[model samples]
Target chain A: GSHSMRYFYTSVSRPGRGEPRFIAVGYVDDTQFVRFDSDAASQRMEPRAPWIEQEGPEYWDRNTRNVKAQSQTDRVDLGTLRGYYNQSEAGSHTIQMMYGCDVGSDGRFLRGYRQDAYDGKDYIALKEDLRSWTAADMAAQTTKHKWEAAHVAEQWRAYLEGTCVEWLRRYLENGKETLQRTDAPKTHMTHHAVSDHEATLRCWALSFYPAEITLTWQRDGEDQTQDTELVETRPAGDGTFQKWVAVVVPSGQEQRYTCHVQHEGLPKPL
Target chain B: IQRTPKIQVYSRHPAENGKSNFLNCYVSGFHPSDIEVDLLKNGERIEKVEHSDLSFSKDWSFYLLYYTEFTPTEKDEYACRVNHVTLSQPKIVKWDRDM
Candidate 1:
């Protein structure tokens, strides 16, 4: 039997005056398989809080259901929660972590840690090179903190089996109230003329609260998702998020194309 | 393979009446890393410009953001002029204090 799968892990955080909340998402191929919102967990922002995994679809619901059955909550203290986010100004700190692995995909293979920092400066460390990294190299680069990086990742792995699994089970069982809130995204479409006869049309969905959304490309009433390239959804530094998708078309064929976006916040595609 | 830079200007903290202040002009998502940027005040050129190293996006597209620190006296129009190979003409963008 031959099997291949693509997966990605990511997280989003909003620094609150008291207990900041983070939202994370997991994906398989181009489809979202799971999501996590820290606010729903009833735990405050801890370093570990940022790494926790929360929700998943029914097919991936094995571990969460078990954790829920053994139920108890609040593993981290409230005093510690208050000390962290309040120490910084409201919305002062924001972090985004994303890494992905692909196996047997179409012309693609990647595995790396791409972390966006609190400041504008961001960096990535490849999984391929972590084993050979020297101690001095780890100390010299700000992003090269491999020990803490590896430790936190392992901690998160443990937390997912215990705390997050329980939280996700509860989240799934009470689906109505958990999915009640909504935030609409702002959409903008613009075209860049790359050459005299060719252009790239960029469709940007920005300032949306929930990170999940769909971007579809249509050319002359036919779905053209095959030719589209979608960038990862990224935090906008504010509580909202953004994503960009683009398609290449002939320069004068602009009128034949349109971008359709769907989000939980909207009743219909926009 | 060619893309023009997108520019944005912002200040993290307010400009105190008579103290050092900073403004950043972020020119990002362009191709080929090499580009030129100029900061202007009241339609005049400022000699000093500090820039960060060219950084690539996830897909290998290159970009760089530059910042200029100044002490403001009164109402002055600040602007940035960016020149990149992809652009047929230099693009100019201005910053307004009131807005």
Candidate 2:
């Protein structure tokens, strides 16, 4: 059963003299910041506060959001209501909702704070005192929005998978019918030697088409080695290219490194 | 020839009603090769208590101990893995009532 969320809100300490005066106010669980300027005359009624609607959950994982969360201090620079509305439209209210911090079991919940409100602003206790918020009110107001990693992760994964799928579909358009073997006329070889300390033999197989490639290390023309580690292979971004490596060789051993690349174009490993 | 090490986990006894359970994360797949097991709780890792007498499949999925005492704060995610220098990531079993 899903739990009901208790709504809450917090205000930052007003900005000091000479600083742009903007009051940040927003609902709890929603770490968003809307602006207000209590000092603005025409805007004095309700502060003409900036507002933000949830752009759904996906918007919460953008790099900008990650940057805000990582930096632990990015906030929406909502101009004061006086100057905010003076700029244009109903209100040139630019707002930013972001993660203030990662809340662990430590029980520290994030709250929004305001910095330079010349006329000052007050916290509204929706359920209790109409004038100000109490300690319990603060507790109820501050909330560490639960981490919805799975939901956000799914969105990101889908984005990446979609991109890959799009690329795949485009590739399929190139055509896929007949298998023709176009073998390279020349079979090339590149040999690398390991010094006494270079006991670990690492080699990469190379072929015009990595689809037909292999690598091996031999001593006295015989395969002999130990502590071999094969790391993940990286595809040559060109689509038909690829590379790999073998590592952790025993020192002081003379080893001949060989890459036996194979492709359907090749009869066997030469 | 250098021999690689491996570790495995196994349930020693089984309860038909699924009331209690006893298990030992053992060293099996590593039969030909030797292995060591380190237990951990509350983030503190416990190392090398005694050689395991328990034996089971490499997958650590074969036996069920009888009337073994088992308790849990919550029937939650539990996992064991075969660790090797090549494989640093643990094979974990996570149980969450997500469905």
Candidate 3:
């Protein structure tokens, strides 16, 4: 869904359980709004609504309509929903969150997701934003989301575990459960020139369906953490995710460092 | 929309009457890798120009920088013409001779 706004941005999502569903709609840069779960638990996604707080019906009507229109437009089956907008003097670039779901797996979950920015002209991977994020910054972002996840964990868990598990069980009543298999990650390694004597080795893990993946730098069978940085996992705009872990090392020592990836889908580290 | 490039003209040493001075045009952060760089002197395209290879950004999210160096016999109004898909037409980034 899209809208033309003078100086505001809105995000809409169905993040929790039940048919009624938990629709969270809010302005991005700050709280400026509130969220209501299906269980009558009302919580503000952010702390502050700087504009027209405690206003009349007109304010609520104006803010609510754009998000409802957006919700009606972008209808998806089931996954993490998201949206964002950038409102500047030039114009407004609105992006809606989209997800790609993979079926036939033992568990039903989000395969990957991307934020389609600016009327779907540009796609930004949800996780790739951490490519430039520092370790501490990434941690802070994760913590913030984790807090929300904890609040909605029970609802989402019940939704997935009950409905999805029963569906998978019934679908596999033919005793062909072996067909449900995870996809392994396609991994590769490359090096870039950082300076005259220094180079950065980037290990690219792409098309991995499951988000739970670990990337590590190893030097001669030993864990090498010095001067190593791992980026946040990002979606590949497809039904898979990608990530990069970089290590700065002497140009001549490049041969000694190797990138090891561990995922549930893979039989062993790659 | 296209993001305009940040352009700057730098010299390694002071310009002298007869000695050669390297005028480097640094252009970065333009979209669409197929960008054309034209080195200009006094509003005219210079015949001889050297360009460095295109360097991809770390995440490859469209951050690119290209360098062109010209051995200027005399300092005039030097510029680099950058043509990209995002731009309606070729954009000119003039060299700040005073800088």
Q: Identify the leading candidate in terms of lDDT.
A: 1
Runs in model 1 deviating more than 4 A are A1-180, B1-99
Task: Give the count of colliding residue pairs in each prediction.
Answer: 0, 24, 2
Point to the candidate with the largest TM-score. Answer: 3
lDDT at A250, model 1:
89
Q: Once superposed on the true structure, which residue ranges of model 3 sit more than 4 Å away at CA?
A: A1-164, A168-179, B1-99
lDDT by residue for model 2 (A13-43), tens: 2234432222223221211122223334533
Among incorrect, acceptable, medium and high, the docking class of model 2 is incorrect
- Per-candidate TM vs. native? 0.32, 0.22, 0.33
Q: What are the per-residue Cα lDDT tens digits for candidate 3 across A1-270?
A: 111001122122323422322233322111113332223343223222333344456745654564445444543311222222223323322223332222234344322222332332333333432112111233334433654556543443443345434433433342232223345788877778777899889887776755668999999889999889875554332335566788988879898998888887787654
In candidate 3, the residue pairs with backbone N, CA or C atoms under 3 Å apart (3 or more residues apart, or in different chains) clash, namely A1-A70, A32-A49
Pick out the ten consecutive residues of candidate 1 chain B with the lowest summed lDDT: B52-61
TM-score of chain B of each: 0.83, 0.38, 0.68
lDDT at B45 for candidate 1? 78
The candidate 1 chain A region of ten consecutive residues with least summed lDDT is A1-10
Those runs of model 2 whose alpha carbons end farther than 4 Å from true positions after fitting are A1-196, A210-212, A247-259, B1-99
lDDT of 3 at A91: 31
